Design a binder for this molecule. Sequence first.
Ligand SMILES: CCCCCCc1ccccc1
Length: 164
Amino acid sequence: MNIFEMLRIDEGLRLKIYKDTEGYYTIGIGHLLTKSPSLNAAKSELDKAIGRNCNGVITKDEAEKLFNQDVDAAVRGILRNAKLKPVYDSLDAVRRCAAINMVFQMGETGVAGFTNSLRMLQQKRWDEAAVNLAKSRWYNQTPNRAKRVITTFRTGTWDAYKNL
Ligand SMILES: CCCCCCc1ccccc1
């Protein structure tokens, strides 16, 4: 298991524009195109992202390229964020994947809300962190994914993903 396999399980793979769990136009392996209600706006973003006229459809290779870029961007975002970097640097390799997973899903605008979770993770209080992380819109709206990510933080193992 690695971050690519983990996120591929959590995000799936679809080659045509679809709506994500929040109703937003998305493609590939959880590549958000726009939060605009306009499908035309989403198609413009897709064509810009891929560099050709896609008419709402991409290849698997194109999906995997966007995914590589998106994982890289999630990691760089963590490294650039004064609140996230010290916590990330304190984690082992498996838990670092859980961190990247959350940033990939939610971005960074809600980082302050996770202040207490971050402190518990830095303190290596894994069970307490797991309890705190579940007290969230994130957990309530995507509970199965959140449970997998939280189990990964709690245990530092891939147990929640193995079967998958
Ligand atoms: C969406 C913010 C989640 C913060 C807690 C998990 C995490 C993410 C990134 C680096 C360290 C910890």
